């Protein structure tokens, strides 16, 4: 009994219901900080609590959305861009990342200054997007999965429309041919571990 079991058992059902749903739209937000402002935040932007603590290399963003009642199943995404274009990528994505319609309640961005201070290799994953089922019982609803897939793809093209240079996907992640910045990983689960992810029902529902 688990989130992944419900997925395996409704695998085709979720896939068919999802492809039949109309494009979902996200009202992007404008009253948002730009990267430099984020580097220097404790503050709050449209529901998301912003935190930068030093024992980290990230600036965290978390919204206490009282709807996502499910429990974390380890599903998350990364966004990889050339280290130098983090500020350009962040600005481009800010409208969505802070959107009231975004399905992602918790995410983080690499803080370039702390990346230098802590001599951290920044070739990829400057952004991390956390995801968990919407249903109190921890099962992903087809409507939620669809919105999440639409969201991720909205991220993808917003980045390429802005000519953002692709980064290097973390070796512990997987991604389709059509994902130039986005990659997937499930932390609750070598290139053996990568094919494991590739057959993950959640990942396949975001890809095929």
Curated annotation (Swiss-Prot):
Variant or mutagenesis effect after changing residue 120 to Q: Loss of enzymatic activity
Active site: 78 (proton donor), 108 (proton acceptor)
Pfam family, one: VRP3
Effect of residue 62 to E: Slight decrease in enzymatic activity
One GO CC term on file: extracellular region
EC number: 4.2.3.-
Keyword Nucleotidyltransferase carried by entry: no
GO molecular function, a single term: lyase activity
Gene3D superfamilies, per database record: phosphothreonine lyase
Root EC class: lyase
Mutant phenotype after disruption: Strains lacking this gene are attenuated for systemic virulence in mice.
Alphabetized InterPro entries for the sequence: OspF/SpvC, OspF/SpvC_sf
Activity-pH dependence: Optimum pH is 8.5.
Subcellular location: Secreted
Stretches that traverse the bilayer: none
Keywords annotated in UniProt: Lyase, Plasmid, Secreted, Virulence
Keyword Transit peptide among UniProt keywords: no
Superkingdom, natural source: Bacteria
Phenotype upon changing residue 106 to E: Slight decrease in enzymatic activity
NCBIfam families: PRK15245.1
Function text: Secreted effector that irreversibly inactivates host MAP kinases by catalyzing the dephosphorylation of the phosphothreonine residue in the pT-X-pY motif in MAPK2/ERK2, MAPK3/ERK1, and p38, via a beta-elimination reaction leading to a dehydrobutyrine residue. Is also able to remove the phosphate group from phospho-JNK in vitro, but JNK may not be a substrate in vivo. Could help suppress localized pro-inflammatory responses at infection foci in the spleen and liver, and thereby facilitate bacterial growth.
Family stated for the protein in its record: Belongs to the phosphothreonine lyase family.
Name of this chain's protein: MAPK phosphothreonine lyase
